[PDB]
């Protein structure tokens, strides 16, 4: 005291706000690729006409 008060530090408090992985549970497949693009082929075959 007098000149400047001594201080005892308590542990730092951190409001570390993450954003948790929720939607990524439906994106489990991982593809790392160096080709320019990814491509799909989708086929619809109605074998239900009379």
């Amino acid at each position: 005291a007098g000149l400047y008060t001594t201080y005892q530090l308590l542990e730092v408090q951190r409001k570390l706000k993450t954003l948790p992985a929720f939607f990524l549970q439906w994106f489990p497949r991982q593809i790392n690729f160096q080709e320019d693009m990814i491509a799909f082929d989708k086929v619809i075959q109605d074998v239900t006409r009379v």
Partner: protein
């Protein structure tokens, strides 16, 4: 200043916020020159007709006066007659800098440094 305090009490010791000046990765380049007016830290500066640094003052004049064309960013503050170190190159966060009045929006703050080695832009 003599006595301690024996009584209990609280105290808000203070707060600290970083000031980020750089907003990119150009070659940061600096120079020093005499000041003509009281210049604050990271104030945008021009050079007056006598070659002394003066805080940037657009619409100074009817022909525009040389104070009106910005030339750098003060690196440390200075009073008139003292030397000011200032940036002449680099990419700078417009928010941290001291600006003239009416030079409000980033769209205007860029227009001051288009023909120049300095470029001024937003942080994310």
């Amino acid at each position: 200043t003599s006595l301690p305090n024996y009584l209990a009490g609280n105290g808000d010791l203070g707060s600290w916020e970083p000031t980020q000046i750089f907003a990119g990765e150009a070659d940061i380049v600096t120079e020093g020159g005499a000041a003509g007016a009281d210049i604050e830290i990271y104030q945008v500066i021009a050079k007056n007709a006598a070659g002394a640094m003066v805080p940037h003052d657009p619409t100074a004049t009817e022909v525009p006066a040389p104070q009106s064309v910005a030339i750098g960013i003060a690196a440390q503050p200075a009073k008139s007659g003292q030397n000011v170190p200032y940036y002449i190159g680099g990419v700078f966060n417009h928010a941290a800098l001291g600006w003239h009045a009416s030079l409000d929006t980033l769209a205007k703050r860029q227009a001051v440094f288009d023909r120049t080695n300095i470029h001024i832009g937003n942080l994310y």
